[PDB]
Every structure is written in structure tokens, then in C-alpha cells.
Structure 1
């Protein structure tokens, strides 16, 4: 009994199955409104054995995350790679509020810090289809039948609704590497100005949080007199009580499907349909150093544009793929005229964003303003400005994508125009974002 490790548990079918069942190792994680929670339905077939390693080195590990909607992911002890893989789903399904404490302005920064006092027993691994090894996991026939039924529906909207239901039941990600044992976790969030030395702030917060967990007090004070609110989680207490204490790898559930079906499912999950159209120069505005362009002609019914651009060739039109439903975050948001001494739109839904300042008088009841839309926060990434103009009153930024080596993070080069100094007062925050290419489906025939 004493001295048993994960090897003794795994060799025993009864203990191995108890470990599998008590930890939901056969189930996906639903990245939904309540945070990462396991699905109640088995995603994979029960294996005959588990690949495991032994590790008993207890210690305190601290991690930091800068993404906005990843608080609950940090509270579940996901590592950086797992958080990165899971962030899109959480962001899409999260509940947005204009009174969130998280700040990500160009002058102010926010970050989550987590300290785990770990008593490990080892690590368990699952083989994904992408790796060519022969012990790959097998998807449960129920899930495969669900995917086939979803893809067999007549209309694209029906298929997308079926897939959305399917992934709300079975989950969005599957944990491929998990750590077993016990853990005492402390979590906090800190906001600080970007002018401060980031390394010192991180070290101070780490020292405070590690001291809090080590001596384990809902409020802590660091060396720099930083007032931190700490959330504590207990996952300690014998092999009967071992639990998952950390996730070091997750794979999107769609990535487990065979390639011909995987591509179709991934395409059908794109929130928007895209279309390129011709542009037209905006009359007037000769004082500006650049020409302003809007989509030419009437916008086709059901399609929307994203803002004024400096691109004289083409403009992007987007159409939502899923209908509006209560409890679901729409891909696009309407805009409303401001309150006073401004003619700029404001997003109706909190935390949404549009890409361009409006060059004119925005009216949400008449075209072309009736079809201008903002974007869900998971659709966009920060861009980079390039200024044109000799004076403050006439300067305009053109926003360009931030170049990245990996195509997964590529954004459209729409050349959205942002006026440097808007006349009046009470104007909205200035857009500084670009649209992700992975969110838009082209040439779908719809």
C-alpha cells in the first residue's frame, strides 16, 4: 500500500479504471461560460492501459498569463501552450462586461499570476492521431455518429447548429498530457502601467503569492505595497484521492477527426463568410493626407462591412454563419450614435470592437451605417499604426497587421483608417485592431 506509485495503479485494472473515471480522463473539456468544465459524455474509447511517468518532487511553481479571458484557465492550472490552444473557445463563449477589471490599454497592462504548491505523483499521456504511433486514441462511436449526423444536414446553417450543439456536449478540447497528485493553488490578477519595469513587478507579485501559498488570508501585500486579492483552491486529500493537478497539453477536439472530415468541420466552424467587393472614394475629405474608401454600391442583403479603409482596390464584406440565439455571443455587433459632441459609432455589445473611425456622420438607421458592424473580441488582434499627415489636425493612422511567422495568427491587411485627432469630445476609444484570417471563410458558395 505505502510506496505505491502510478505504476501500481495502472497495472491494476480496478485501480486504473478508478483513476480514469475519477479524473474524467475520457472526456473533453467544455470551454464555456462557466470556465473549463469536463463533459459528461465520453469522447474516446476506454484504453486497455495508460502511458505514465513517475515524479514525486514537491515544489512551488509560478506562472503568468497576459491574455484577457484566461482567468479560469489559469485557475485550472493550464500551462502556456494549453492556455493558448484553449483561449479562442473561452473568449468566444465568455460572458462580456464593460465593468471588467482587466485592462489592456496601450498605457496600462494586466496579468494573471498563479502559484501552485504541487505534490506530484507522475504524468499520464495520450496519443493523438497527428503523431504516427500505433497506440492512438479512438474516438467513441457515439461522437463519430454525431459528427456524421451534423455533417449530413441539408443546409449549411443546420450543419453549423448541429456542430455547435455537438461541441457544447462533448467539449472543445481534450487533455493529452495531465499531471496527477495533489495541489494547493493561489491565484491573483495585477494591473500596472506599462512604464514600470515589468520584470520587477512580476518578481514582486511572484514573491507575494509564493509566500501566501507556502504559509498556507484573502488579501496580500507585497514588498512594493501592492494590494493583491488571492483566490485559494484546495486539491489535496493514498492513491484513492489522486487528482489532476496540471494540464501540460490539450488538443482541439476537431483535430482528433480524420482529415477529410476535419477540414470540413473546421471550415464550418468559421464565424464569418467573407467576400471581396469594389470600393469607392468618399466625397470630400480633401484635407486628409490619404483617400478614404467605402464599399461601392448597395451592400447585398445580409452582408456587412467593417469600416473605412485606405485600400483603393477592394473591401471586405462579412456575413455571420450562425443565427442569433439567446445565451450565444454574436459574431458581429451593431453600432449606435454617440451621446454628445461626437459623430462616431459606439459598440452596442460590451467588449466588442470595430476597426475604423467613421469619416462622416454615422447614422445606424440609414446606409451605409446601417450595415457597419463591430467584431467579437476573439475575432481581432492588435495591429500597428503608420501615420500620414504633417499636422495633428490632419494626421491619420493606417493600421497594418503585425507580421508573424506562423500563418495561424495572420490578420487581414484591410488598411483601416483611424483619425489621429477626432474633433469634439466624448469620442469612443480609438481602434487599434485587425481581423484574424482564420475567422473568415472564402469561396463557400453561400
Structure 2
């Protein structure tokens, strides 16, 4: 009747548990996977709690489902921000890599080095993990499919649930069955290095520029404002807005390279019966419906860009206008971390034509833009 307390007190068993579960390695994000590099130093002991409240559940709504869960406890790693005596120590190799990345001359080199480092070391680290064994079964039948998944316990007895349940008490087969706390790797660094790294990792540089009223459109209930003057070379704007004070220009921080999704996408004229832009990349989004005739070959449409889906979050509409033909939404951030700019993006409720793009409904995250960097 051994528990996590029995394996944690034994150096051999504790190290076997640590190694077989990749507890010293970060997570790289086909899906999340552990990194081959060890991120933190091997601890002398682990903080753990015991939990043996096993469960067997089944359901036959033919979507039959089954779940045999057998927990053993929870293991918790302690982060620098907690301030406790025990703190996970970053591997000297990782710290040296960070310092080497930050030592390069230009910001582009510093960002590329950090990208390589975080690709080979992972983006996040699991600080709270639940240990044990879970056996799940699914059988959707109308044609017919069956799916058995085993995570922990003797996996060679997946076909025989009795023997798997019997084996669930062998400590050599305990695995991580759930993660309840994840901390960004950058958050494990000292404060100045943490700030520098988190600023460098931001995909976009930002800049405020005064605005000008779009000529015409007197029928609308609110004025339309666009960046005044010529856009600085290499910078891009995000769409029409109702803000009368400022507009946000953005610039990519990383050069385009094969295999990486650019932060911004070019926009192309619509196929037929519509003057709105369409995103060149599949799942990218822009924030404002274009007012006027879009054209990707001449300004200001030549410098309008759409954002990567991870840069934006859904917003909320505030409606203006006494009728549908006059109605327009203004997009405001869903007031809540991960806050979004109050750009006040304008979105016409009913565009004159047919076959128009889907109505934009998003606002840009404030954490994706770097300001006043001198870049």
C-alpha cells in the first residue's frame, strides 16, 4: 500500500518518477509536448499530497463512454514569485542561453535567439501535476468506432480492465494524469531579465498617430477616422476607428521565415459584389469594416493588415444609428491580464453588397504590442 510519500522519500523511486514524467522539462507548443532539455535543476525533494479517491464512471447516452480514474496525489513546484525558501532553480544552461541571447547587438538578433531558445526549451512549465492512472474508453456507434486510451498503470493490460485496475497500485507505472497549474518559462527569470525577455518576445511594436476624418459618409451616425498623413515606411494600421484622438500603427518584430506564421496578413480585394478586404491567410482577422472602396495596391489600403488569431479576443458591440442602413457597431474590449486596446473599431451592421466577409468582432490584445522601445 505504497503512496507518493514512499516514492518521494526514496531517491531511486523519486528520480524514476521525475524522469519518467519529464517533471524537469518544459512544454513545447501537433500539440503540447515535453522538451528534451531539462529546464530546472533536479530538486532534493518534492512537495506532494496524497489522494487515493479512485473513481469508475460510465455513460451510455450510441455514444458510450467510460473512465476509470485512480489518483495517487498531487506534486507541486514552487515559483520565484511565491518568495518561499525553496524555489525551483533554473538550469545553468538555460540561464546562460538567455544571457547569450540578450547579449546580441540588434533587437532582431535578440528576438531570434530567444525564439530558438524557447523552441528548444519550451514555452511553459507545469508547476502543479496530478499523479496516477486513467483509462478512458469511447465507442460512438451509428459507422462504428472504438477508442481506448491508457495514461498510467500497466499499459500492456489496456485490453483487460480488471488487470489494469489491479496494476494501478504499482508505483513504477504512475504518470501525470492532469495539470492544474502552468507557469510561463519567462516568469521564472529574475525581474530585470524577465522584463527584458517579455518585452522582446512581443510580436508587434506599437505607435500612436493622429487621425483625420474620412471625407463623405455624412449619412453615418458617427464620424470615421483614419491615420492622418502617410504611414511611416514599414508600419501598418489596423482599420477604421471612431476614436478622434489617436490611431494605432503596428510593426512586426520578427522577419518572416518558413514554418512560422507572420503576426500580420496582407489583405486582398474581394472576389465579387463586395468592396471589403479579405485576409490572405486562412484564420487571420481584421478589426474594422473598410469604409469606401478597398484597394491593396494603393494607400491607405496597401498598408492595412489583419492580425494573427492569437493576437485578438472577441469584443462587444455598441450600436449607433436609427435604422439598419445607418446602423454601425463600435467594438469595445470585454472589460475583464490579457486586456485589449479600446481602439473603437467601426463595423457597419449591413454592408450594401452581398458576399461580404464575415463581420469582424475582435479587439487587439494589449500584451502583443511593444511601445516606446526606440524601434
Give the alignment's TM-score, normalised by structure 2: 0.90
Structure of greater Rg: 2
CA contact (8 A) 1:182 1:237 kept: no
Structure 2 alignment gaps of length 5 or more: 151-167
Distance 1:265 1:391, change over 3 A: same
Distance 1:148 1:435, change over 3 A: same
In angstroms, what is the RMSD of aligned CA positions? 2.9
Aligned with 1:144: secondary structure? Answer: helix
Q: Aligned partners of 1:243, 1:142: CA distance in 2, in Å? A: 27
Superposition deviation, residue 313 in structure 1: 1.1
Structure 1 stretches of 4+ with a deviation exceeding 4 A read 60-64, 111-116, 186-189, 225-232
Q: Aligned partners of 2:247, 2:115: CA distance in 1, in Å? A: 29
Residue 421 of structure 1 corresponds to which residue in structure 2? 350
Aligned with 1:20: secondary structure? Answer: helix
Distance 1:253 1:359, change over 3 A: same
Superposition deviation, residue 30 in structure 1: 0.6
Distance 1:121 1:323, change over 3 A: same
Superposition deviation, residue 180 in structure 1: 1.2
CA contact (8 A) 1:343 1:361 kept: yes
Superposition deviation, residue 122 in structure 1: 1.4
Distance 1:294 1:254, change over 3 A: same
Distance 1:63 1:355, change over 3 A: farther
Superposition deviation, residue 187 in structure 1: 8.0
Q: Aligned partners of 1:131, 1:113: CA distance in 2, in Å? A: 44
Q: Aligned partners of 1:415, 1:228: CA distance in 2, in Å? A: 50
Distance 1:112 1:285, change over 3 A: farther
Deviations 1:392-414 (A, max 9, x none): 1111111111111xxx1321111
Distance 1:26 1:116, change over 3 A: farther
Distance 1:294 1:264, change over 3 A: same
Deviations 1:152-195 (A, max 9, x none): 11111111111111111111111111111111246899xxxxxx
Superposition deviation, residue 115 in structure 1: 7.7
Alignment of 1:48-63 (within 5 A): 48-59=44-55
CA contact (8 A) 1:186 1:233 kept: yes
Aligned with 1:409: secondary structure? Answer: coil
Deviations 1:57-90 (A, max 9, x none): 11258999xxxxxxxxxxxxxxxxxxxxxxxxxx
Distance 1:186 1:175, change over 3 A: farther
Give the alignment's TM-score, normalised by structure 1: 0.76
Q: Aligned partners of 2:125, 2:297: CA distance in 1, in Å? A: 45
CA contact (8 A) 1:306 1:373 kept: yes
CA contact (8 A) 1:336 1:363 kept: yes
Distance 1:243 1:429, change over 3 A: same
Q: Aligned partners of 1:160, 1:114: CA distance in 2, in Å? A: 46
Superposition deviation, residue 135 in structure 1: 1.4
Distance 1:402 1:297, change over 3 A: same
Distance 1:352 1:298, change over 3 A: same
Structure 1 alignment gaps of length 5 or more: 65-110, 190-224
Q: Aligned partners of 1:123, 1:44: CA distance in 2, in Å? A: 19
Q: Aligned partners of 2:22, 2:279: CA distance in 1, in Å? A: 40
Superposition deviation, residue 248 in structure 1: 1.2
Q: Aligned partners of 2:137, 2:280: CA distance in 1, in Å? A: 36
Q: Aligned partners of 1:281, 1:228: CA distance in 2, in Å? A: 61
Distance 1:158 1:357, change over 3 A: same
**How many residue pairs end up in the alignment?**
357
Q: Aligned partners of 1:143, 1:63: CA distance in 2, in Å? A: 47
